[PDB]
RNA sequence: UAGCGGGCGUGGAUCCCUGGAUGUCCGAAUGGGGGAACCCGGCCGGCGGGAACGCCGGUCACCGCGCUUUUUGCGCGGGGGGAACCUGGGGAACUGAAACAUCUCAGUACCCAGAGGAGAGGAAAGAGAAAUCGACUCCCUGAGUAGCGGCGAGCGAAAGGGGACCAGCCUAAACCGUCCGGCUUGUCCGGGCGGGGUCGUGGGGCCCUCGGCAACCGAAUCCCCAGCCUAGCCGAAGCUGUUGGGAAGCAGCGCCAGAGAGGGUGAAAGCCCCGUAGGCGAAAGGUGGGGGGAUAGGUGAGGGUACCCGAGUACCCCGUGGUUCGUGGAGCCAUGGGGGAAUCUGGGCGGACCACCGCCUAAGGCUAAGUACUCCGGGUGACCGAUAGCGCACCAGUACCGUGAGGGAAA
RNA sequence: GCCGACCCGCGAGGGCGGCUGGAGGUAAGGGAAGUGCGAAUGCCGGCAUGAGUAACGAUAAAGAGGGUGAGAAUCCCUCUCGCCGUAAGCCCAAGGGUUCCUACGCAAUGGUCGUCAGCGUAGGGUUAGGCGGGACCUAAGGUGAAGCCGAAAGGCGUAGCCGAA
RNA sequence: GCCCGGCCAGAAGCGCAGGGUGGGAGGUAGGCAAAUCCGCCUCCCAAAAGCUCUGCGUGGUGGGGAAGCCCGUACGGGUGACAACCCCCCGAAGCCAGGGAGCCAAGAAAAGCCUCUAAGCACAACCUGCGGGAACCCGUACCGCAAACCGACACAGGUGGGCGGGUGCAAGAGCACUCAGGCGCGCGGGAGAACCCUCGCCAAGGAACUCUGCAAGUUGGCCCCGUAACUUCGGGAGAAGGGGUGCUCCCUGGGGUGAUGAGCUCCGGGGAGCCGCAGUGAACAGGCUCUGGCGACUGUUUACCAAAAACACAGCUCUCUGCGAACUCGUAAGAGGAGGUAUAGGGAGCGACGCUUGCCCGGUGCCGGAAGGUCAAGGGGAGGGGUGCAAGCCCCGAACCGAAGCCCCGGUGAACGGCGGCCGUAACUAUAACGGUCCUAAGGUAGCGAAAUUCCUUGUCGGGUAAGUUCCGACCUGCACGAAAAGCGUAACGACCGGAGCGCUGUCUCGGCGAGGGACCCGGUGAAAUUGAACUGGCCGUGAAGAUGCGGCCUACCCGUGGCAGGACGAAAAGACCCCGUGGAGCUUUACUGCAGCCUGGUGUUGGCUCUUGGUCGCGCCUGCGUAGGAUAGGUGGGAGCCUGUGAACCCCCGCCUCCGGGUGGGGGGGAGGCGCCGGUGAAAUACCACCCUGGCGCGGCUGGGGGCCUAACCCUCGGAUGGGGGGACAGCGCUUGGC
RNA sequence: CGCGGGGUGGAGCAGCCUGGUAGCUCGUCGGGCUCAUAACCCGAAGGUCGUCGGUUCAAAUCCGGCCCCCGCAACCA
């Protein structure tokens, strides 16, 4: 999948194989395929309870930056789901 | 739709239009189950002697959002369908290349998600050579041009010009006030609300000097009206003879015409009937900027300081998509992976790259009109006339065939 | 539309006359096309040939009297004969869906006939606290809060729920 | 005497027959303890009854109740009884039912039910009994082995469970006949031709038939006698070959029920007779033997032409896999493997069992190999280029460092596979144990052999027959056997294929007669493929080369009915063969190109500590052994003097390198020199100093490799975890690089 | 096409490093020992160390061009 602040989905874009020179010519052989986002689990505490974020490495910090603003946010009550949701 | 058998209507029925009422059961189907149209319940209330049974009324699915002191709840919303049109996510092959693999068919068929009477796009980090144009969309042209291409098959733009339409806006950030939480009291750390602000003649913030504004703009938001729509109404002018089963034909004389469209009437009718020309009409519902009113908004000039101007973004590299561009000298737009800034002496672009000269302000969002379609209503055809025309003129998506998806007549 | 021995044209056709038909037709001159059929094992429909031919669906088998009736080898009744009898009898389940019973009826259906029928028309008929099933239980399996996964559609799946010969 | 019938249900109670069950006391650390229940430990008692549950019988009482006759469409109503309603016997696979024994392949769940306690409650609630009351929804016709369901149809097909009587036969659900009940299959009537179907019989012969004894026939059940090779000792065996079987009377043995018996009933043994052609008098009802091949065997298969020698099989070997297993499906989550753990699981081959399974590792595969060679991105950056006045920006790019793979070095055959050619020789002839030579990775071993393999071929010899392209036995010039695509054998088994013999036969010589169902005639109903049109003959020619249709000649009144099948190049299917098309599809591989998959370097996720080592830049300090000349002078240059005060020529102890001669640098000290000399002289020359090369060491910056430790990401796991344990910066996953 | 390292006696090869060494092995000849044959031992003949130029006192050794061979990688309208 892709979920989280990352935004990033999984783009399907083809890889095309070539034999050649480039300074004599260059020919081909092509087909479809998909690239994935570097998703990664990210644990973090925030208030009570743990909480996790299947997110790309490219936005891992954004999570900790996101927890920073959460501390200043008056929040509580058992709700791991609602935590994450309220965490924007 | 006649028959048996009974009724109603000028105290104005049937009928037409508008609004309301009732609407078993299934179906997004929503109390639960389920082999759709069936079965079984919780809670509150009612009925039957009514505890046991049964019926009746109300209520109870799930998800999102905002509250709610949390709990339990309350409120707003969603769900499914739609002929084609629209956007997006995925996305073939036959075929063409007279084989075939790049390429083609094609981002087509189709699958999926979503939107609406439209959808999309849209206020330049644009175009590209004029120191020029000034959102977007659609038509003509430019143009089969530029160019792409096993430079094969074949594909194929844009600027500009002629037209349709015409509209422009809101934010984020600095900065000020407030509330809540935090510490190590600071124009402080975070969060919510309001004020402030919104741009390329670069703008804004904060300071100093002048109106300390009446004014002038003004809606895409409201409200009133015209108008139109969903029933209707008025509407000119001909008689005699004659043949005929039947006059509208034939013969004589006559009239109307803003009406001599058409249909019907036993045959061929301007004047027989319904109409036609031209006029009139709504208690009720829908529509309504075309006109009018109102509000929401919105606006000046210098000087100073260097506070702010959208980040894993720009930018570079790797792998790709889009474009006329098939790796090509390959920019530009987009982005899966890696490295990774600055805030206007800042950044992007004008086809590698560098200098010069110019253009434009990315990383937030909204916007009517011109455009597409035809389930539905009307009008018209050098359109068919029952083997035609929709598959169906008719009791047809039926009969019948198939486990099913599905096929599908005749009349 | 049917007919002609007639007229005109080289011909494709045109015209005339007679009969049928019963409500439309469209000169000269021009315009536009779904415009001419004998063959496509063409398409649809009708009708022929084979032909009064093959066949009438198990070689378990018939006969007679009486009755009904427009009509009887075929319907009813009686007697005689034959056939099945781990069935060719009897009772459940599934599937079928009024074929059940009563009366009336023979156009069609019945491979002949038909007065008969599983056929036509009308009327009636299916009664449960104890049978079966549900207001009980679970199986495979299905579904599926929670959870996990997937471009979308969706896949996996705990509790629960559904599911019986 | 014949014929008809001589029962059904039933609460309590009673009785017969079974099912289930230990009782009491104490202790308790388990049943995610809450328990007085369960479990576990201990003691005592009876060890059986008691208790509980079911079946069967009985049981107040209720129900039913035949033949025959009269009336009768149907259908029953009476008669018809006041009906009788009892005894014995056989006896289930069903009941008592969770009965019993043995066996291995080890045989659902949940609720009801009972018990225990929690919350809670105890004015409740729960249990037993009694009274009064309450008890909804759906199905319910009819068909249902078939005319009502599935097959387009009143279709000779298909469709799961139960009852399914009597008699006879070894027994039975078999076969024959028959109850109850049901039916005579929805066209008939005649005829008694050919021909076809189904059936019976046949003189003499008896496989001569034929590809083949195809088919048919022979035999059949039960009892007794009797029975070979071979064998894995189970078999072969129903071997083979024979005898008996009916009825009658007499004598007689055993079991069951009852009572030890009468009767009933089951199983027999002995003797004497009787009749027929024939006694399991009809119907179920093996013909037999020898000998090869193949496959061990039961089993499986091409629904609709193949049932086999094919598949499978128990078993043998190879190989993968240490568990989050390998492998399989899935994009993933996951699932299978397996709730299994190397005596397990996956893949492959061979295919009971017996005796065996030889040589070749050169190529191919797979396995091992810290060297080396080649190699991608990436690192590096000598050097080069574009542009600008410039600081810069941009680009190209060598050396060197980079993984799998490939090369290379080995191993490996129950891994793919392979397992020779020529010439000569033994006082007959023939042959060749022996030899020569060429090539190979190695040259086919055992055993088998004109074979399910043998082309020549009907090889040759023997056997069998009168006669044998087949069959068996044997030779071996094996076109073209051969050892787990196993080799050679093997008892038993086979709707397997080959050869023979006995018995018996219409297979035949060789046909005949008879029966029924059709064909034929009459009445009723009434198709089909096919069809250019037809007024459709023979011969000999002719013609696209095979004429009813052309020519010549011959022949032939018109129309049919039953038959035959030579022609109409008959009907059917736009040839399945062949070719063609720059057709199609399935399959193969060291065809091409790709994709999945897997391997792999870099990098993100990715962190802490420490040791070691390399590249490179910089700074410091060092090593450098040819003449003469005075040196045994790393390269070069200035340079007369100058340097030793940053204190001279120069004396003892330590570190390091080594060409063993010495260089050089650390701890205390001496005292003013060192070298130079055009002389001398070498390519160029000696003070000191400076830069520089060859390699080394120390310090620092950028940067790469390797080892160990750690934990906190990440993965696994643990009766909740904010956590403990395990792995661990690996793995997994994103992007990218090469390879298979 | 670029990159990498080779040529030395009759044959194979060290020495190249970093300058003062041409060696080894078999082969050929003589001799020693021997049934024979090798083994062993002694001695010996034989190389501008590819070519032409270059630095050097002195190289095959360091340098430049080139001849030829071997190998590496790439391309092939
Ligand atoms: Mg993903
Ligand atoms: Mg991203
Ligand atoms: Mg994309
Ligand atoms: Mg690629
Ligand atoms: Mg290619
Ligand atoms: Mg993490
Ligand atoms: Mg964690
Ligand atoms: Mg990061
Ligand atoms: Mg990053
Ligand atoms: Mg970030
Ligand atoms: Mg809470
Ligand atoms: Mg909330
Ligand atoms: Mg009416
Ligand atoms: Mg009145
Ligand atoms: Mg009225
Ligand atoms: Mg109502
Ligand atoms: Mg609701
Ligand atoms: Mg239902
Ligand atoms: Mg009452
Ligand atoms: Mg009540
Ligand atoms: Mg109700
Ligand atoms: Mg949701
Ligand atoms: Mg609010
Ligand atoms: Mg609350
Ligand atoms: Mg709370
Ligand atoms: Mg609402
Ligand atoms: Mg519609
Ligand atoms: Mg084309
Ligand atoms: Mg073509
Ligand atoms: Mg082709
Ligand atoms: Mg395209
Ligand atoms: Mg598109
Ligand atoms: Mg959606
Ligand atoms: Mg919508
Ligand atoms: Mg709208
Ligand atoms: Mg658009
Ligand atoms: Mg210019
Ligand atoms: Mg312009
Ligand atoms: Mg502008
Ligand atoms: Mg546009
Ligand atoms: Mg348009
Ligand atoms: Mg236009
Ligand atoms: Mg060209
Ligand atoms: Mg071409
Ligand atoms: Mg327009
Ligand atoms: Mg217009
Ligand atoms: Mg607080
Ligand atoms: Mg803050
Ligand atoms: Mg406006
Ligand atoms: Mg109206
Ligand atoms: Mg008027
Ligand atoms: Mg008058
Ligand atoms: Mg008139
Ligand atoms: Mg007239
Ligand atoms: Mg007229
Ligand atoms: Mg007219
Ligand atoms: Mg008219
Ligand atoms: Mg008007
Ligand atoms: Mg009106
Ligand atoms: Mg009103
Ligand atoms: Mg309306
Ligand atoms: Mg309207
Ligand atoms: Mg107005
Ligand atoms: Mg105002
Ligand atoms: Mg930032
Ligand atoms: Mg920022
Ligand atoms: Mg971003
Ligand atoms: Mg790359
Ligand atoms: Mg190209
Ligand atoms: Mg392209
Ligand atoms: Mg090009
Ligand atoms: Mg550029
Ligand atoms: Mg990116
Ligand atoms: Mg900057
Ligand atoms: Mg850009
Ligand atoms: Mg530009
Ligand atoms: Mg470039
Ligand atoms: Mg621009
Ligand atoms: Mg933003
Ligand atoms: Mg019609
Ligand atoms: Mg239609
Ligand atoms: Mg049609
Ligand atoms: Mg219609
Ligand atoms: Mg209807
Ligand atoms: Mg209709
Ligand atoms: Mg049709
Ligand atoms: Mg005439
Ligand atoms: Mg005439
Ligand atoms: Mg003419
Ligand atoms: Mg006309
Ligand atoms: Mg014309
Ligand atoms: Mg046409
Ligand atoms: Mg034709
Ligand atoms: Mg028709
Ligand atoms: Mg018709
Ligand atoms: Mg006809
Ligand atoms: Mg006929
Ligand atoms: Mg006849
Ligand atoms: Mg018939
Ligand atoms: Mg028939
Ligand atoms: Mg009579
Ligand atoms: Mg009559
Ligand atoms: Mg009959
Ligand atoms: Mg049976
Ligand atoms: Mg039925
Ligand atoms: Mg039915
Ligand atoms: Mg009839
Ligand atoms: Mg009839
Ligand atoms: Mg009929
Ligand atoms: Mg029939
Ligand atoms: Mg009759
Ligand atoms: Mg009658
Ligand atoms: Mg009735
Ligand atoms: Mg049942
Ligand atoms: Mg109830
Ligand atoms: Mg996608
Ligand atoms: Mg799961
Ligand atoms: Mg799960
Ligand atoms: Mg009797
Ligand atoms: Mg214990
Ligand atoms: Mg417990
Ligand atoms: Mg305890
Ligand atoms: Mg107790
Ligand atoms: Mg005791
Ligand atoms: Mg007792
Ligand atoms: Mg007792
Ligand atoms: Mg009981
Ligand atoms: Mg009786
Ligand atoms: Mg009587
Ligand atoms: Mg009578
Ligand atoms: Mg009676
Ligand atoms: Mg009596
Ligand atoms: Mg007695
Ligand atoms: Mg038994
Ligand atoms: Mg039992
Ligand atoms: Mg038991
Ligand atoms: Mg068990
Ligand atoms: Mg108990
Ligand atoms: Mg209490
Ligand atoms: Mg009841
Ligand atoms: Mg109920
Ligand atoms: Mg129901
Ligand atoms: Mg019933
Ligand atoms: Mg049957
Ligand atoms: Mg059957
Ligand atoms: Mg039936
Ligand atoms: Mg039926
Ligand atoms: Mg029948
Ligand atoms: Mg059949
Ligand atoms: Mg069936
Ligand atoms: Mg069944
Ligand atoms: Mg009986
Ligand atoms: Mg028997
Ligand atoms: Mg028997
Ligand atoms: Mg017996
Ligand atoms: Mg018997
Ligand atoms: Mg039968
Ligand atoms: Mg007759
Ligand atoms: Mg006869
Ligand atoms: Mg006869
Ligand atoms: Mg027979
Ligand atoms: Mg006989
Ligand atoms: Mg004989
Ligand atoms: Mg023969
Ligand atoms: Mg045969
Ligand atoms: Mg034969
Ligand atoms: Mg025989
Ligand atoms: Mg014997
Ligand atoms: Mg013997
Ligand atoms: Mg034994
Ligand atoms: Mg035997
Ligand atoms: Mg004997
Ligand atoms: Mg007898
Ligand atoms: Mg005895
Ligand atoms: Mg017997
Ligand atoms: Mg017999
Ligand atoms: Mg037998
Ligand atoms: Mg037999
Ligand atoms: Mg015999
Ligand atoms: Mg014998
Ligand atoms: Mg054989
Ligand atoms: Mg065997
Ligand atoms: Mg076997
Ligand atoms: Mg067996
Ligand atoms: Mg068997
Ligand atoms: Mg088949
Ligand atoms: Mg056959
Ligand atoms: Mg068989
Ligand atoms: Mg076989
Ligand atoms: Mg098979
Ligand atoms: Mg074995
Ligand atoms: Mg393996
Ligand atoms: Mg593991
Ligand atoms: Mg584990
Ligand atoms: Mg398991
Ligand atoms: Mg196992
Ligand atoms: Mg051997
Ligand atoms: Mg050997
Ligand atoms: Mg090998
Ligand atoms: Mg080897
Ligand atoms: Mg292999
Ligand atoms: Mg190496
Ligand atoms: Mg350089
Ligand atoms: Mg240069
Ligand atoms: Mg730059
Ligand atoms: Mg590496
Ligand atoms: Mg190689
Ligand atoms: Mg093997
Ligand atoms: Mg080989
Ligand atoms: Mg053999
Ligand atoms: Mg032989
Ligand atoms: Mg032979
Ligand atoms: Mg064989
Ligand atoms: Mg054979
Ligand atoms: Mg052979
Ligand atoms: Mg030959
Ligand atoms: Mg041959
Ligand atoms: Mg032969
Ligand atoms: Mg032969
Ligand atoms: Mg012979
Ligand atoms: Mg002989
Ligand atoms: Mg031999
Ligand atoms: Mg020979
Ligand atoms: Mg052979
Ligand atoms: Mg052999
Ligand atoms: Mg045996
Ligand atoms: Mg067999
Ligand atoms: Mg004999
Ligand atoms: Mg004869
Ligand atoms: Mg006979
Ligand atoms: Mg006859
Ligand atoms: Mg002749
Ligand atoms: Mg001719
Ligand atoms: Mg001929
Ligand atoms: Mg002629
Ligand atoms: Mg003739
Ligand atoms: Mg005749
Ligand atoms: Mg013939
Ligand atoms: Mg052939
Ligand atoms: Mg052809
Ligand atoms: Mg052709
Ligand atoms: Mg070709
Ligand atoms: Mg061609
Ligand atoms: Mg083709
Ligand atoms: Mg290959
Ligand atoms: Mg290969
Ligand atoms: Mg592919
Ligand atoms: Mg180092
Ligand atoms: Mg010298
Ligand atoms: Mg010297
Ligand atoms: Mg000298
Ligand atoms: Mg010396
Ligand atoms: Mg020295
Ligand atoms: Mg020196
Ligand atoms: Mg001294
Ligand atoms: Mg010391
Ligand atoms: Mg010394
Ligand atoms: Mg010293
Ligand atoms: Mg000292
Ligand atoms: Mg002293
Ligand atoms: Mg001293
Ligand atoms: Mg000199
Ligand atoms: Mg000096
Ligand atoms: Mg100096
Ligand atoms: Mg130098
Ligand atoms: Mg350092
Ligand atoms: Mg655990
Ligand atoms: Mg925590
Ligand atoms: Mg992951
Ligand atoms: Mg391989
Ligand atoms: Mg390989
Ligand atoms: Mg090149
Ligand atoms: Mg070249
Ligand atoms: Mg070259
Ligand atoms: Mg190299
Ligand atoms: Mg020599
Ligand atoms: Mg020798
Ligand atoms: Mg020389
Ligand atoms: Mg020399
Ligand atoms: Mg020379
Ligand atoms: Mg190389
Ligand atoms: Mg090249
Ligand atoms: Mg080449």
Swiss-Prot record:
SUPFAM superfamilies on file: L28p-like
Protein name: Large ribosomal subunit protein bL28
GO MF entries: structural constituent of ribosome
HAMAP family tied to this protein: Ribosomal_bL28
Gene: rpmB
Ribosomal protein recorded as keyword: yes
InterPro entries (alphabetical): Bacterial_rp_bL28, Ribosomal_bL28, Ribosomal_bL28/bL31-like_sf, Ribosomal_bL28_bact-type
Listed PANTHER family: 50S RIBOSOMAL PROTEIN L28 (PTHR39080), LARGE RIBOSOMAL SUBUNIT PROTEIN BL28A (PTHR39080:SF1)
Keyword Metal-binding on entry: no
Protein family per UniProt: Belongs to the bacterial ribosomal protein bL28 family.
Alphabetical UniProt keywords: Ribonucleoprotein, Ribosomal protein
Biological process per Gene Ontology, one example term: translation
């Amino acid at each position: 999948s892709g979920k989280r602040p990352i935004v990033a989905n999984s783009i399907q874009r083809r890889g095309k194989a070539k034999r050649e020179g480039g300074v004599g010519k260059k020919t081909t052989g092509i087909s479809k395929r998909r690239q994935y986002p570097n998703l990664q689990k990210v644990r973090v505490r925030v208030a009570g309870q743990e909480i996790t974020f299947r997110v790309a490495a490219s936005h891992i910090p954004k999570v900790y930056e996101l927890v920073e603003r959460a501390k200043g946010l008056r929040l509580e009550g058992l709700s791991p789901k609602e935590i994450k949701k309220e965490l924007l």
